[PDB]
């Protein structure tokens, strides 16, 4: 059972990659009782650059083939109390995203759910809440509202909405 991210154009099979991390943005509200909302960061490439874990692969929202963390998932941010400051989440165990060439790539829903749970646990330890809600990207250009990546000299765009739509409790 897998999550299917639809991609345009169809990514060839040799573009299958390893999600080693991602970049998030917390939705405005600070203390909304106990539910904190995060979304995939759709800002500037320099945010991904300031994360400094993305590796050599050009990618938005999700870091492909980047550097993984040593022991456990680690979240970082210039300022936790600021929403404009992005959240660089470095995974500990990569999640393989496999592309078939049929216009969509696939991610194991069990592995992605475990990754989301670990991310939510670390975000809960940081922001001191309980409920973590991953919501989709709140608009922008095609390169940052979608998960985009350059492979084989071609830029591919994949709707990552089904990766960021879940609730995680304590």
């Amino acid at each position, epitope marked *: 059972d897998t999550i299917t991210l639809p991609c345009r154009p169809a990514p060839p099979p040799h573009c299958s990659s390893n999600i080693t991390g991602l970049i998030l943005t917390r939705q405005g509200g600070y203390s909304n009782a106990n539910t904190v909302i995060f979304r995939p960061s759709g800002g500037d490439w320099r945010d991904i650059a300031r994360c400094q874990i993305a590796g*050599t692969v*050009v990618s938005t929202q999700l870091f492909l083939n980047g550097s993984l963390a040593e022991e456990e998932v680690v979240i970082r941010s210039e300022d936790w109390r600021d929403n404009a400051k992005s959240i660089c989440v470095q995974l500990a165990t990569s999640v393989e995203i496999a592309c078939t060439g049929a216009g969509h790539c696939a991610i194991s829903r069990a592995k992605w759910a475990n990754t989301l749970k670990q991310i939510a646990s670390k975000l809960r330890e940081q922001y001191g809440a309980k409920t973590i809600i991953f919501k989709p990207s709140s608009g922008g250009d095609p390169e*940052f509202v979608n998960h985009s990546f350059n492979c084989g000299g071609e830029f591919f765009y994949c709707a990552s909405t089904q990766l960021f739509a879940s609730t995680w409790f304590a």
Partner: antibody, heavy 116, light 109 residues
Framework: EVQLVESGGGLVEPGGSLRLSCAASGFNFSNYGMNWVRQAPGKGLECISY????????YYADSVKGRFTISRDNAKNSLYLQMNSLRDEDTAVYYC?????????WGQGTLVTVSS | TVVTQEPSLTVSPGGTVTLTCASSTGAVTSGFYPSWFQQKPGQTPRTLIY???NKHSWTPARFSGSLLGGKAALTLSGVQPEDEADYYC?????????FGGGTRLTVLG
């Protein structure tokens, strides 16, 4: 198609001022940072200045700090370089380059000759 | 902060040449987002490689970016006579782009 077109340039007397303009088409100009990169005749490339998409971040090279001023109008798809206190060392072809994982798209370049 | 390239290199057609790009501030990593530009005489610099090794659609297949010994490396394998140009290396220093000195590549054939 991404297009960057420089205007301004030409002859300027030493100590005078000039304003380079760069009109952008084919992309959401507000969604990308911009760079001014100059090249003296017969010399290498030098990255002069950078302005962020919201014109919030501006970096300047040491050689042009305090003299050059980078600006932009997003509603007009225009990038601007206000060059003041020009010296003979500022004579160069000035290129306008988009900031997208590097300098992926450049302008055709406009020659600025500082001569009395 | 100086970004250093070989001033000139010479290669026969069909051969292989490797241009190196070193940073005075430590060793070049993937976070320096190296770019390689090709400038034929009087032409606008043209991006061949960005982010260590990514290519544009217009980049010829024979060009390849890489990282050896803390230096960025542009490898031209199977040189063609029109590959003769100046190759500038561009490094990223936390928001500050810094160009290299350039390398004059002469196809000696």
């Amino acid at each position: 198609e991404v297009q960057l077109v420089e205007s301004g340039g030409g002859l300027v007397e030493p100590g005078g001022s000039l304003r380079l303009s760069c009109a952008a088409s084919g992309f959401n100009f507000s969604n990308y940072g911009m760079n001014w990169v100059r090249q003296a005749p017969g010399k290498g490339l030098e990255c002069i200045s950078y302005i962020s998409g919201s014109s919030s971040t501006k970096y300047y090279a040491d050689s042009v700090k305090g003299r050059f001023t980078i600006s932009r109008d997003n509603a007009k798809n225009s990038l601007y370089l206000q060059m003041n206190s020009l010296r003979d060392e500022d004579t160069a072809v000035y290129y306008c380059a988009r900031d997208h994982w590097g300098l992926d798209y450049w302008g055709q370049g406009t020659l600025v000759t500082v001569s009395s | 902060t100086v970004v250093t390239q070989e001033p000139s290199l010479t290669v026969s057609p069909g051969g292989t040449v490797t241009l190196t790009c070193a940073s005075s501030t430590g060793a070049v990593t993937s976070g320096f987002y190296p770019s390689w530009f090709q400038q034929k005489p009087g032409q606008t610099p043209r991006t061949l490689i960005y982010s260590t090794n990514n290519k544009h659609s217009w980049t010829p297949a024979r060009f390849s970016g890489s990282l050896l010994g803390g230096k960025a490396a542009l490898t031209l394998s199977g040189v063609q006579p029109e590959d003769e140009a100046d190759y500038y290396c561009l490094l990223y220093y936390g928001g500050v782009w810094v160009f290299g000195g350039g390398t004059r590549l002469t196809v000696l054939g």
